[PDB]
């Protein structure tokens, strides 16, 4: 199974984070409404699932995991949140996510 950071949004006290867990045929999307800033800026991905999230939305696995529908570049969770922020900072600014 591969975990992707698919979407992020900077908030006043943290970050909204969306993670897709993909295996052979299933995509499970986890919506984390509020992740502390300290976890985000330090790439503490091992602490991500310690925080509250919605129940996973289950759908068929996509044939491609390049960019999300907004245009942000999708990164693997092991690459860290800072990677996602670095590649998508300008686009997130135009979508009120940064």
């Amino acid at each position: 199974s591969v975990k992707y950071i698919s979407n992020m949004s900077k908030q006043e006290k943290g970050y909204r984070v969306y993670v897709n867990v993909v295996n052979e045929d299933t995509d499970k999307g986890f919506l984390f409404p509020s992740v502390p800033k300290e976890v985000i800026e330090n790439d503490k991905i091992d602490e991500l699932f310690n925080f509250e999230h919605h129940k996973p939305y289950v759908q068929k696995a996509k044939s491609r995991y390049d960019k999300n529908g907004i245009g942000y570049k999708i990164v693997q969770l092991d690459e860290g949140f800072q990677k996602f922020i670095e590649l998508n900072k300008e686009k997130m600014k135009e979508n009120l996510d940064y």
């Binding site: 992707y4 698919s6 979407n7 949004s9 909204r16 969306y18 897709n20 999307g29 919506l31 409404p33 919605h54 129940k55 939305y57 759908q59 999300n68 529908g69 907004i70 999708i74 979508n95 009120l96 996510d97």
Partner: protein, 144 residues
């Protein structure tokens, strides 16, 4: 009402009979698909009405709301991608075309600023809780 009345006269009463609900939602939304914020030209809605569907903001499984407060006109693909999710759950995903922040800013202005939508519809659109939770479904049932 006057704009809708002019549309009915030009389109004819026959075409107005089957699409009046979509025309009202289109007028309410100022011609915008609420989930993609893309333009829905009136001529395309009148000529290809099946390309646009009436989505229930909160699934009636949870909402029990079939009124206009729980209905929005969206592109067919957006209704398909959303599934049984809230707008918040859908727009935070990787399946959406716009961010929830852009969506929320537009919805707040559509309600507070323009008054095009009801307070009930605004709270449906900006619902940020997990509608799959026992407690959240209980709150929706108890609000009745």
């Amino acid at each position: 009402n006057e704009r809708i009345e002019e549309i009915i006269r030009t389109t004819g009463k026959e075409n107005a009979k089957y699409l009046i609900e979509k025309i009202k939602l289109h007028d309410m939304q100022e011609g915008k698909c609420l989930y993609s914020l893309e333009a829905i030209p009136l001529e395309d809605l009148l000529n290809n009405p099946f390309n646009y569907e009436v989505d229930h903001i909160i699934p009636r499984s949870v909402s029990f709301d079939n009124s206009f407060n729980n209905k929005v006109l969206v592109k067919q693909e957006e209704n398909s991608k959303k599934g049984n999710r809230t707008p918040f759950q859908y727009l935070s995903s990787s399946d959406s075309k716009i961010s929830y922040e852009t969506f929320k800013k537009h919805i707040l202005n559509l309600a507070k600023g323009k008054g095009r939508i009801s307070k009930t519809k605004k709270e449906y659109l900006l619902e940020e809780r997990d509608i799959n939770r026992f407690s959240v479904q209980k709150d929706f049932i108890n609000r009745n």
